[PDB]
Chain length 34, copies 4
């Protein structure tokens, strides 16, 4: 239970979540003008 | 730790999906150049 | 844990922060000109 | 100080930072000649 390890884990989870949300928005936007 | 394993697998899938996304968008925005 | 894990944790936190600033900049540019 | 999964994820995180840095660098560059 290193603080850096736990923070890095949570940040990786949040990073992938926000990435799929951002790219979902952008892929839905680009899925209309093509 | 289960948290470390979850974060590791999420990081690997994140890199893989980001690479596929980058290939998609680089081959989609490589026609303009 | 080991230097590899510590550096990887610092780097993952940096990566989240950097991608946050990148997407915030792009969303602020696409939230005023669209 | 050795989990194979942890070492793999660490190397992957470093390479991910490097690749995203290069991606956004050349992206910002392309978006620097167009603005
Ligand atoms: N992309 C980051 C890189 C650092 C780790 C994943 C998230 C990796 C696996 C676990 C254990 C350490 C710290 C994080 C969680 C090394």
């Amino acid at each position: 239970s290193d603080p850096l390890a736990v923070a890095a884990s949570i940040i990786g989870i949040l990073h992938l979540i926000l990435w799929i949300l951002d790219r979902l928005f952008f892929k839905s936007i680009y899925r209309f003008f093509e």
